[PDB]
């Protein structure tokens, strides 16, 4: 095992590239990093609990893990009020102790185990060229991923349910008894346009849809796991792909980049799997809340909000979407596809109903709209809330903003990693990753371009 | 032998004067479509209701613009993020009014430049090159995707994307500053470091190589004729350039390895433009620049201004006047 650049040809800043053909040390690096991930989860949850005022909204306190635990239906009641501090602390303690175990295991394999696992066992020994063993490891990880999806399903169906922001009576921890097993709905979520009003899979709007999709995902992942364990890669796959460790890393980097982009869009737009009681309003929710708040205020002042025309000729409070639905006016016309549990009571078949706006607005909807409008995901890097022209007195940046920004940056840099590693994998498998051979420089044997 | 294999060999040929490749089979149609629609729209598109308030903005040359003021105006705020192709319009005139050309040009352009980056990798692979020129090109691509796609997505409307014109770009930048305080954002500062340093180091590299050229011409002819294309030998004395630059600052501040110097020349503006692309992409989600407004108070509690407060006065003046007829409520939520 080379630990210097004369013995490896990799400098120290590329030094983990010395681990490419050292399987046991590579397993140790992974387990040690996994331990880092579980350590952050545990220690950050303990920090968030220690910095938690439970009578204060979670989105007001810069918390990102307690909303995730609360969305699963742990320690929360109707409208996201924290009934119990203890489940969040339990989740933190469990991750922190498992991380200690994982760090010990990673450090063992990285510093005292077999450096290569192929001289000890044929089960854990992997060669990157060995397509069958790598597909077996794919199959194992697929089986466990399907089990995790089914574990989420088990939590939502048989272990107290999850937080439904759309539940009648207001959002609450409810048990999903009828998940949609219909493949038309589940897989037509995949065929919906990734644009306005359709939103691809970001527009999943009910806990039944999410739980049925996770049953389908668990079934698909377990079936695919059994597939990669029982089959070898076919000739089209072997002829199209690069079969090397850097190649498999770059394939995973491309997938990770995709998933980080999707998560940023998911936390920015979806309020079903990211409920606004925990993550705060979305940008669309806050803009629609501002329009609704001033509709309510001016209606209380006697203004005819239907017949009120604005300075431009459009309605000041109510207008038509380009397909004709009755929507809020002002710049929020762009956010007319927003659906939220405080606003769907006032929506008729044609859009915002005039009768419901006239005589069915409840005080809790007014309170929720004012809170969401004043908690719009707008904030300075130093956490100063509101528009950037505001003075320094409101310490707020939405968790949706933090999560979307972070995961968009991570998705981009992991697309950069995919490009760097996909190109290097192709160059190294082709043999010119170290530069052009002077004697056999390929351009020197080509005809001139003109 | 097969027709498909003959087509594959033509597509992947290094003997094409312009390399096509499989990424080029997507690049060329999308870029030609975007180019043709951009030229036709820049000359002769009718005015576009960008703010969705029936206030159409003349963007094209035939409607009173010059080259500086001309733009392909972004699609309507009433559309928002909605997909608006030609076949979703009741007529071509409606499509033009609502800013459909911007959506067409921007979507085909973004596909085309992503395929340009893929094609750069593809040709480096066919030429036996190292593959990371496409990584350097991913910094302008990320910046273009930030201002044409990611900022509309975060703001929720393609009307918020940068206009395809010179004065439209200036309008985008000024509204960006008034709303996000991009100058106070450290990612933009890293971008300014990237472009200022990239130009600095371009001037340095060029000036040192031009300074240390080996005498191979007379004083009459241009010194560039001292280099022959495909010559084996070095055209300039790197050791002389290093001796000069390690006496200009000090010895250990100067590169002697040309490969480390060129990696630095590649890496500095690319990392700067990556950071500023991420800055614009994160102010898409309203994570704005630093707010130091009323940060200094006296012991009574009165606000003592700084330069950030004067900057905020400028930002307010830009904000209260922007999209003057589009706001109906007290806060510009997005």
């Amino acid at each position: 095992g080379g630990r210097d650049l004369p013995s490896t040809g990799f400098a120290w800043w590329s030094g983990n590239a010395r681990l490419i053909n050292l399987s046991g040390k590579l397993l140790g690096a992974h387990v040690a990093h996994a331990g880092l991930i579980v350590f952050w989860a545990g220690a950050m949850t303990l920090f968030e609990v220690a910095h938690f005022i439970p009578e204060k909204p979670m989105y007001e306190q810069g918390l990102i893990l307690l909303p995730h635990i609360a969305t699963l239906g742990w320690g929360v009641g109707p409208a996201g009020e924290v009934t119990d501090i203890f489940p969040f602390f339990v989740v933190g303690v469990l991750h922190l102790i498992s991380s200690a175990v994982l760090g010990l295991g990673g450090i063992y394999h990285a510093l005292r185990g077999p450096e290569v696992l192929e001289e000890y066992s044929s089960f854990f020994g992997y060669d990157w060229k060995d397509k069958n063993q790598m597909t077996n490891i794919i199959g194992y990880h697929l089986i466990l991923l399907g089990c995790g999806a089914l574990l989420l399903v088990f939590k939502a169906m048989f272990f107290g349910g999850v937080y439904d922001t759309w539940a009648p009576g207001g959002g609450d921890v409810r048990v999903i008894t009828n998940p949609t097993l219909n493949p038309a709905i589940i897989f037509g979520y995949l065929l919906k346009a990734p644009f306005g009003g359709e939103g691809w899979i970001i527009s999943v709007n009910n806990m039944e849809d999410i739980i049925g999709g996770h049953i389908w995902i668990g079934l698909i992942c377990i079936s695919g796991g059994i597939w990669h364990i029982l089959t070898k890669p076919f000739g089209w796959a072997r002829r199209a792909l690069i079969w090397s460790g850097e190649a498999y890393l770059s394939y995973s980097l491309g997938a990770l980049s995709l998933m980080g982009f999707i998560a940023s869009v998911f936390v920015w737009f979806n309020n079903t799997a990211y409920p606004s009681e925990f993550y705060g309003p979305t940008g669309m929710e806050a803009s629609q809340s501002q329009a609704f708040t001033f509709l309510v205020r001016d209606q209380r002042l006697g203004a005819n909000i239907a017949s009120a025309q604005g300075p431009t000729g459009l309605g000041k409070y109510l207008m038509r979407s380009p397909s004709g639905e009755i929507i809020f006016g002002g710049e929020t016309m762009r956010f007319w596809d927003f659906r939220g549990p405080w606003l769907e009571p006032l929506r008729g078949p044609n859009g915002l109903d005039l009768d419901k706006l006239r005589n069915d607005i409840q005080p809790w909807q007014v309170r929720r709209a004012a809170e969401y409008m004043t908690h719009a995901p707008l904030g300075s890097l130093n956490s100063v809330g509101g528009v950037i022209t505001d003075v320094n007195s409101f310490n707020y940046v939405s968790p949706r903003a933090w999560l979307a920004t972070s995961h968009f940056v991570l998705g981009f840099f992991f697309l950069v990693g995919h490009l760097w590693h996909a190109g290097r994998a192709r160059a190294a498998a082709a043999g010119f990753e170290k530069g052009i051979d002077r004697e056999t420089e390929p351009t020197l044997f080509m005809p001139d371009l003109d | 032998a097969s027709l498909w294999e003959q087509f594959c060999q033509w597509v992947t040929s290094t003997n094409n004067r312009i390399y096509v490749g499989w990424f080029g089979t997507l690049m060329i149609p999308t870029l030609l479509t975007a180019t043709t629609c951009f030229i036709i729209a820049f000359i002769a598109a009718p005015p576009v209701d960008i703010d969705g308030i029936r206030e159409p903005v003349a963007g094209s040359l035939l409607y009173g613009n010059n080259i500086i003021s001309g733009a392909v105006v972004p699609s309507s705020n009433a559309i928002g993020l909605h997909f608006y192709p030609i076949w979703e319009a009741a007529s071509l005139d409606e499509w033009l009014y609502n800013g459909g050309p911007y959506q067409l040009v921007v979507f085909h352009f973004l596909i085309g430049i992503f395929c340009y980056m893929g094609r750069q990798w593809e040709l480096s692979y066919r030429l036996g090159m190292r593959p990371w020129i496409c990584v350097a090109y991913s910094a302008p691509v990320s910046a273009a995707t930030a201002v044409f796609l990611i900022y509309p997505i975060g703001q929720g409307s393609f009307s918020e994307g940068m206009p395809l014109g010179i004065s439209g770009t200036f309008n985008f930048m000024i509204v960006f500053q008034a709303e996000h305080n991009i100058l106070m954002h450290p990612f933009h500062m890293l971008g300014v470091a990237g472009v200022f340093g990239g130009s600095l180091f371009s001037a340095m590299h060029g000036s040192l190589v031009t300074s240390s050229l080996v005498r191979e011409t007379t004083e009459v002819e241009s010194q560039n004729y001292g280099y022959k294309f495909g010559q084996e030998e070095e055209t300039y004395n790197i050791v002389a350039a290093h001796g000069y630059f390690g006496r200009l600052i000090f010895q250990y501040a100067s590169f002697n390895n040309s490969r480390s110097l060129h990696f630095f020349l590649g890496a500095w503006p690319v990392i700067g433009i990556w950071f500023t692309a991420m800055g614009v992409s994160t102010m898409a989600f309203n994570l704005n620049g630093f707010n130091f407004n009323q940060s200094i108070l006296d012991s009574q509690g009165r606000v003592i201004g700084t330069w950030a407060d004067v900057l905020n006065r400028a930002n307010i003046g830009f904000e209260v006047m922007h999209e003057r007829n589009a706001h109906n409520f007290p806060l510009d939520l997005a």
């Binding site: - | 040359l61 010059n66 001309g70 294309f229």
Partner: peptide, 30 residues
Amino acid sequence: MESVAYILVLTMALAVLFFAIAFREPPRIE
């Protein structure tokens, strides 16, 4: 009528681009 002048100068730049690509001096190894 300024539109004609703008079209001419943009067309001159694009024609220069075409003739510089299609009819460059070929780089020759010698």
